[PDB]
Design a binder for this molecule. Structure first.
Ligand SMILES: Nc1nc2c(ncn2[C@H]2C[C@H](O)[C@@H](COP(=O)(O)NP(=O)(O)OP(=O)(O)O)O2)c(=O)[nH]1
Ligand SMILES: [Mn+2]
Ligand SMILES: [Mn+2]
Length: 430
DNA sequence: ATTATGACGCT
DNA sequence: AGCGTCAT
């Protein structure tokens, strides 16, 4: 009872940009704004592959992973923007720079954890304590939460979406105890006020809209963020978890969408996250390992301890290109030329990183895939990265992979390569 | 012939 | 160190 810690110590937010690459292209080209729009890489094969979709286009069924030609079948008026091509490959520099814009704004409010190109976690615990001190017990006005949904409300005792949102927010605010500076629900609420301010700053200063989740940990904040996209934020309280999880398919929780989640479902004969509560911690550890079992036991009760890492910058800088079907690399000249192209992009990105961020990578990872292997990587080899020189990096990558070529002929490469990947890692302050 | 990444766990 | 998983 009283000693049963409830995972309510922290306030954590997850901010995720809406259809990010689409918004970057819509800012640049006003003709794409408020239209069914998608971003594609390449063009020749099936119109190119879609990686981002505006919410207008999603209404027609357009999705990530779809070929543009098929998307045009669903939505003939779909507008398309192509990712830049440099040195023969997709070049994502424009979106990385737009990402830095957003991350720098977020960092004004709190130390952030960059989780991807378009989303970051925020530990708002301390900022919430400060704003609570300033409030002096003043209640929180619904006017300060103009885009916030409270998950699970309204309940009990109404036709429009905004009306439902305000109804739920009113129920939430009317139930709040604002004389208690340690009430977790009050803390989440103040956290949501701060996130409204953060999202307002992002849109004012970049033109980009985002959604957000506010809860007591990273997994619940990420799930919350998804509930009311786009351009809205959602508060998931500790108390909302039993109802939320009672119908939540296990695969919706981050990290359970793959083989482990499928094993949970098959071994335990369950479907929803809430069903996990009936097992003991030892039972779950016995099926899924000590770490996974402890994580599942806590997570199905809304409890998770993974910290928001103080990390605004990526830990690695990498360059990769697939060579599918008949484009697979089958000569030594080909393999060398593409290693050079990747290494030249890598050198450019690394040199800009060193100038911006006062650090130097010290290890080069070379990964390849060979024809007939379904795995992502067929082989990974590291070597030393001592100079930011593309010619040296590509020569070193060739040296570490060249023993892969089973061809007796010096010129031919067999079996052909379906992927090259260069990744700079193990950064040190310079 | 989804593709270009990036994070992290395991042994 | 090299490989596998998860993500998207
Ligand atoms: N190159 C590449 N980029 C990708 C891929 N998948 C996503 N991206 C890029 C393009 C995406 O714009 C960006 C962020 O990924 P999300 O947050 O998962 N999707 P979004 O922000 O579009 O929509 P939502 O409003 O639902 O969050 O990552 C991929 O497979 N490859
Ligand atoms: Mn996004
Ligand atoms: Mn994202």
């Amino acid at each position: 009872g009283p000693h049963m810690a409830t995972g309510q110590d922290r306030v954590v937010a997850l901010v995720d940009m809406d259809c990010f690459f689409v918004q970057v292209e819509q800012r640049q080209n006003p003709h794409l704004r408020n239209k069914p729009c998608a971003v594609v890489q390449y063009k020749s094969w099936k119109g190119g592959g879609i990686i981002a979709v505006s919410y207008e286009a999603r209404a027609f069924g357009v999705t990530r992973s779809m070929w543009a030609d098929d998307a045009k079948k669903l939505c003939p008026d779909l507008l398309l923007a192509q990712v830049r091509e440099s040195r023969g490959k997709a070049n994502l520099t424009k979106y990385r720079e737009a990402s830095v814009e957003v991350m720098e704004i977020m960092s004004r409010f709190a130390v952030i954890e960059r989780a991807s190109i378009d989303e970051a976690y925020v530990d708002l615990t301390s900022a919430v304590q400060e704003r609570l001190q300033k409030l002096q017990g003043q209640p929180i006005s619904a006017d300060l939460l103009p885009s916030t949904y409270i998950e699970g409300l309204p309940q009990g005792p109404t036709v429009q979406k905004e009306g439902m949102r305000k109804q739920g927010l009113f129920q939430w605010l009317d139930s709040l105890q604002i004389d208690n500076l340690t009430s977790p629900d009050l803390q989440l609420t103040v956290g949501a006020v701060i996130v409204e301010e953060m999202r307002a700053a992002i849109e004012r200063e970049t033109g980009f809209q985002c959604s957000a989740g506010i809860s007591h940990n990273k997994v619940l904040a990420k799930l919350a963020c998804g509930l009311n996209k786009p351009n809205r934020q959602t508060l998931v309280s500790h108390g909302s978890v039993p109802q939320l999880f009672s119908q939540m398919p296990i695969r919706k929780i981050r990290s359970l969408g793959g083989k482990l989640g499928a094993s949970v479902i098959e071994i335990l004969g369950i479907e929803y996250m809430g069903e996990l509560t009936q097992f003991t911690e030892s039972q779950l550890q016995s099926h899924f390992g000590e770490k996974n079992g402890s994580w599942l036991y806590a997570m199905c009760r809304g409890i998770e301890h993974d910290p928001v890492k103080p990390r605004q910058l990526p830990k690695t800088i990498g360059c990769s290109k697939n060579f599918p079907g008949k484009t697979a690399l089958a000569t030594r000249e080909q393999v060398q030329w593409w290693l050079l192209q990747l290494a030249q992009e890598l050198e450019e990105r690394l040199t800009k990183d060193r100038n911006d961020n006062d650090r130097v990578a010290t290890q080069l990872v070379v990964s390849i895939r060979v024809q007939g292997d379904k795995r992502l990587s067929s082989l990974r080899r590291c070597c030393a990265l001592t100079r930011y020189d593309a010619h040296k990096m590509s020569h070193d990558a060739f040296t570490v992979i060249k023993n892969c070529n089973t061809s007796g002929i010096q010129t031919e490469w067999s079996p052909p390569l379906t992927m090259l990947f260069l990744c700079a890692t193990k950064f040190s302050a310079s």
